[PDB]
Design a protein around this ligand. Structure first.
Ligand SMILES: Nc1ncnc2c1ncn2[C@@H]1O[C@H](COP(=O)(O)OP(=O)(O)O)[C@@H](O)[C@H]1O
Ligand SMILES: [Mn+2]
Length: 267
């Protein structure tokens, strides 16, 4: 369906989407007049385009205070895919691999990079969808770049809410029973130490974000990552270590002291 949606888009549609994208920095709902002026498409025609894009679930239009438009998740993903296609990084989008509360992950093929996944991202006052989703994608991309050569996917590109990376032929740890859990846990903790040496804390280390095969382990899912030195980095690192050791304790009864494991990494 994402491919079908893509095929409904003409040059004028992409220009309208570009105009929203380029004005997200200072509006959630970009005013019609700005979309029109940026796209160099007359207001009545721009309005007609935005109505059709809303019909296709690509934009959400509001009128409470003024006529304004923003991306839906589908629309931001579609636009980001377009940027990837136009930069020659992706040739065809393929089948959905899976979707949940934080992302939708699709298979795709790149003549340059081979079989890939593209991951579309979904998500100081504690109580701007697009701006936050783009920030999430950019963070994952930057973390993956910094960690290249370690046990993570090769990363190829980032546009909008999309990150293009290597497909890993491995399953989530959560789904795999290992017969050497103590060694597996040690390999994970060694990778945590290597990330830390590179100034990166994962931020969501879990049984759902470690992939395993007979061949080894990979770690994925970096939008929550922080740099060492950022507020709370140490407690976030401790959490990653505590959570993965706790998983192994509950599942395998491995005996690994959390305090010593943290202290070993940190020294
Ligand atoms: N590079 C990849 N190779 C293979 N499978 C992947 C890759 N990236 C994501 N996946 C699959 O998609 C799921 C969701 O990806 P993930 O990065 O964990 O995002 P989320 O935050 O939505 O959990 C993963 O648990 C994994 O099964
Ligand atoms: Mn995950």
């Amino acid at each position: 369906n994402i491919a079908e949606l893509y095929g409904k888009m003409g040059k004028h549609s992409w220009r309208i989407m570009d105009a929203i994208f380029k004005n997200l920095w200072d509006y959630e709902y970009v005013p019609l007049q700005l979309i029109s002026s940026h796209a160099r498409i007359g207001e009545e025609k721009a309005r007609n385009i935005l109505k059709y894009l809303s019909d296709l679930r690509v934009v959400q239009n509001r009128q409470k205070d003024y006529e304004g438009s923003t991306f839906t998740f589908i629309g931001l993903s579609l636009y980001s895919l377009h940027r990837l296609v136009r930069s020659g990084k992706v040739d065809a989008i393929g089948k959905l691999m899976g979707e949940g509360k934080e992302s939708a992950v699709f298979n795709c093929y790149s003549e340059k990079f081979g079989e890939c996944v593209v991951k579309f991202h979904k998500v100081k006052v504690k109580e701007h969808f697009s701006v936050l989703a783009i920030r999430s994608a950019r963070n994952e991309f930057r973390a993956l770049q910094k960690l290249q050569g370690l046990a993570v996917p090769k990363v190829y590109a980032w546009e909008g809410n999309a990150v293009l990376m290597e497909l890993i032929d491995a399953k989530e740890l959560y789904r795999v029973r290992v017969e050497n859990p103590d060694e597996v846990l040690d390999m994970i903790l060694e990778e945590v130490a290597k990330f830390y040496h590179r100034g990166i804390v994962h931020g969501d280390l879990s049984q759902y974000n470690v992939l395993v095969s007979e061949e080894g382990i990979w770690i994925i899912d970096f939008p929550q990552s922080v740099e060492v030195g950022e507020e709370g980095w140490r407690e976030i690192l401790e959490r990653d270590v505590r959570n993965i050791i706790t998983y192994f304790s509950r599942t395998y009864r491995t005996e690994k002291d959390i305090n010593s494991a943290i202290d070993r990494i940190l020294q």
